[PDB]
């Protein structure tokens, strides 16, 4: 009786969990021989080919997406005409998202999950500040700046001077900055520039449907990508231990954040115990753990914040609906652990500017992730292509995304709940 | 009395036939010395320079044209709300255009006209399936994917593994696929995405006027291109024999198609003799041979299909006006013989995926060719740039385009006439 | 009392003159040691880095600016429906701007200011005519055509044949030509193509505000650019002599033009003495020298042309407001002396086609310069990037721009004043 009411509703989720559980089985059926006994390199990158085609489609789409959604979502970003009473709420959201992402990078650099087994001088801050502001906007859709060294035989015979050249791989770091600045420009332009907001916001909605079609293709690509990814490692008992250490490190980041950082930020200004606040708001967190979505939590959260932890009733309907779309600390933890776990699963050595352009671009991507159908994974592929990491390891993270999701939902509501607790103590004392 | 009523009406056609007949004369006046006695290579590519400038202008225009006309013509492509009663007519049009193009490629590979006188493994189907879906959309306006080989000294000392890189020459194969998918996306988006259809369909009409100006320049370019093309061959009696074999092979393809393939497709389902149908519709084919245009045939064809070969009168006003713009089998023959005659006039060896991306891109270009002023030749330059063939041989084909046109018009009306004969036998039996 | 009425009004001009006068002081404070005693090349291009960031931002903006302002300003270019009675005025404006620019190039090639201290054959007119009409429009936003030579061992063993390749650096020469032709196309398209004029003219006004923000950043960049530019020369008493010879040559070009060329053009057709005309129009030129702006001159100029040098009263309100925005001979002198002074300040040897694409692109940029905030300097950076000159010397020209501006304003009003004197003698004789 439930063959056309349950399976038809979430057919894509059943299809991708069948494709993952038959992707590990196909990879084990190839690894029973191995990566070189069935067929060698002449057909190794022809068995894994739909798992390359999915990445071709995703890299095709993240060029219109991050430059047409940021223009339409920074031209519709209101200044303090929206209210300076909730601008401290936006500052709190940005600061706690940056602290969440920095805690994720720090914890998955300290615990080091996945690492079980060119020389560039420290002035590559210049190689990032030349990359924020690109030289032109058509040669910043496929290639970025990079400084290489040489010898000129001056002052003796050997000295290392840097020379600059634009090498391949697009810069999403310098194409979200132009998109943000152009969105602020179209907001400042007023009613003369509404045609551009309508054009760039009908172009973003004409790309989300392409994401819908690509995610409908994505079971086949994720099956062959998992199959090609657990064969190339030539080890199955080690990769599941690396995934277990990844889940342990990300759950530890969620627990450490939501039990010691946001309580400390609440205690530093309110100077009342935040655990009484959390004991008031158990049941919205208990249903956010339940349904694993921050949309069905918001009415019950906006209700239950009133009776126990009494607020002024005009900020809890103002910062809470913009606290479940803008403030997402759990997605910041997931992007900043699941993109320094891939950097220790392929040994890319994680230069000190890759930390900055994995931290600020996952702060600037947890505020607009939950509009995309597969939001948290395509917005991880964006920050993987922004630091030139291998995107092919996205399927070992999409395989264990449910264990992380069921405790990732609660941080996104805990953040703006403690923001509602914090912002009421800047108006009860003036 | 007819100096301002006849010459002013078709001045471009008189100008281009004067420029062709003075292009062969100028090429013969240079070949009286030859390609190296007047001036050598220091001024050989300075005498043929306007015939290079015309190709620069055409390659400039086929980037906005095939990506802004396909979006506007696939967003205005109606689904079966247009009618499933004539969706078998569209399937018939696509199948007979593919069969016409395959017959053209097969016949001009078998008879081999024009051939009178890098190693890549058979897995370059991967090099086309990586090219359908490009990696990004700004680096697919000038460069396409291509797999090259090397040696890695593994398993012995010598093995041939493929490595990938994006080499120059744009991919029109993977820029019509994104345009088609984006047009279907803008159709699905409904009334929120009408601004993009108006933008991309005012951008296509603001490029057709550039085609009008370039075709007004085109006499000078075609004169110097013919002059440079019959000098470089260093032979005049052989090139006219190759053009004669080209005209013979394309006329043989038209005759074989319109007398043995579409009759066979009609006989396989209706099982009545199609030559009685053609004996009913002699005179619309006889005036389509006359005026050499499928626009002045359509009222007389839509009339004469009724009285003799009686139809249900609601499909002959429905599939016939969409059978003279969409179904063009003669243009498919002309594109798929005149682009494997250039591949045997310059020895490009015609790899087995170039047959596929000369067959499906001339099936997908005979449905939108007759809106451009010089439609059948610019849409041949498109499929020449899609397979990296030399576009410079377009002027030996535009020189003999009248002998092919006067029997190319009749296939485009014979196709939908037999489609009207076929579709009436899927409703008289239900 | 004047701390919030004078300093708040022109804060950017005070900030940039403080940044220039503290840019020469910082450069002298580094040159007290020199370019290699404080820190060598490992930190020489890290002290001059904001003066590189300003050039990165300017090269980012001149790609949307010159292709979105020319479309919107050539689609709003009226044909002779504006009037053939003032089309000779537009021809006069174009001819005197070309003569002004040619006099500037000739005078700063003859006097040779700043010159105190690859082989390509003369057929690089082909390398410019292949660059006017680019091969495609996405690979003409960052790279242009360039012919290099080789040897093929034919006809002996050594001969020099040219081969072509697209090398880096965008072609603004071939991206204003497509923009002009597209603007004429959108004008011809009529009311079907008003959406594109509104899109490309709301995109140009959404880039002028980015020029406003970049010019607000520009004090820091111009301070560090002046500081890095007077250190690298390793000479301070010579660079100020080169700037003095630059000011002398440009003032000599202004004086020679406005006292011997436009008087000669007036005398060649009217055959009356133009110095009586100038003695009538002393005081509009005397206030144009005063306020240094051609906007506050136009009412007094349009008044004072009537009473003394009597005109037909319908051309002095028609060609004078389009003579203070379109005709700017002083800006043509400044662009065509200040871009062959940089070519003699860095020894780029000034090939005979760089004269043509520094002359016609500064004729085609003095007609739309006075809409940009820093118009005369960004429109100099455009023509410096169009000929691949070093843009880094823009700050030695922006430092002495006031001495040139106060006598550059008077040529832009003298031009259309003598045009009003000229055009009245093609209607008083018919």
Residue numbers in the entry:
A (entry chain B), B (entry chain A), C (entry chain C): 43 to 159, 177 to 489
Anything the authors wrote about it?
The Alanine Serine Cysteine Transporter 2 (ASCT2) belongs to the solute carrier family 1 (SLC1A) of transporters, which in mammals consists of the excitatory amino acid transporters EAAT1–EAAT5 (SLC1A1-3, 6–7) and the neutral amino acid transporters ASCT1-ASCT2 (SLC1A4-5). Although EAATs and ASCTs share significant similarities in sequence (~40%) and structure, they are mechanistically different: EAATs typically concentrate the neurotransmitter l-glutamate against its gradient; whereas ASCTs catalyse the exchange of neutral amino acids. Structures of the prokaryotic SLC1A transporters GltPh and GltTk and the human EAAT1 and ASCT2, in different conformational states, have provided insights into the transport cycle. They all share a similar homotrimeric protein architecture, where each protomer consists of a scaffold and a transport domain. By contrast, each transport domain located at the periphery binds the amino acid and coupling ions, and translocates the substrates across the membrane in an elevator-like manner.
Based on this data, we expected that the substitution of Cys467 in ASCT2 to arginine might change its substrate specificity to acidic amino acids and would allow inhibition by TBOA. ASCT2C467R did no longer support glutamine uptake, but it transported aspartate instead. Although the uptake rate of aspartate by ASCT2C467R was slower than that of glutamine by ASCT2wt, the results confirm that a single point mutation in the substrate binding site was sufficient to switch the substrate specificity of ASCT2 from neutral to acidic amino acids. In addition, aspartate transport could be suppressed by TBOA, which opened the possibility to use the compound to trap the transporter in an open state. We determined the structure of the 172-kDa trimeric ASCT2C467R in presence of TBOA at 3.6 Å resolution by single particle cryo-EM. Strikingly, the ASCT2C467R structure reveals an inward-open state of a SLC1A member. Compared to the previously determined substrate-bound inward-occluded state of ASCT22, the most prominent difference is the conformation of the loop connecting both helices of hairpin 2 (HP2 loop). It has hinged away from the glutamine-binding site towards the scaffold domain by ~8 Å, opening a pathway to the cytoplasm. In the substrate-binding site we observe a patch of non-protein density close to R467. Although the density is too weak to allow for an unambiguous assignment, it most likely represents a TBOA molecule, although the occupancy of the site appears low. Notably, despite different strategies employed during image processing, including 3D classifications with and without symmetry imposed on the trimer or single protomers, only a single conformational state was captured for all protomers, indicating a preferred state of the transporter in the given conditions.
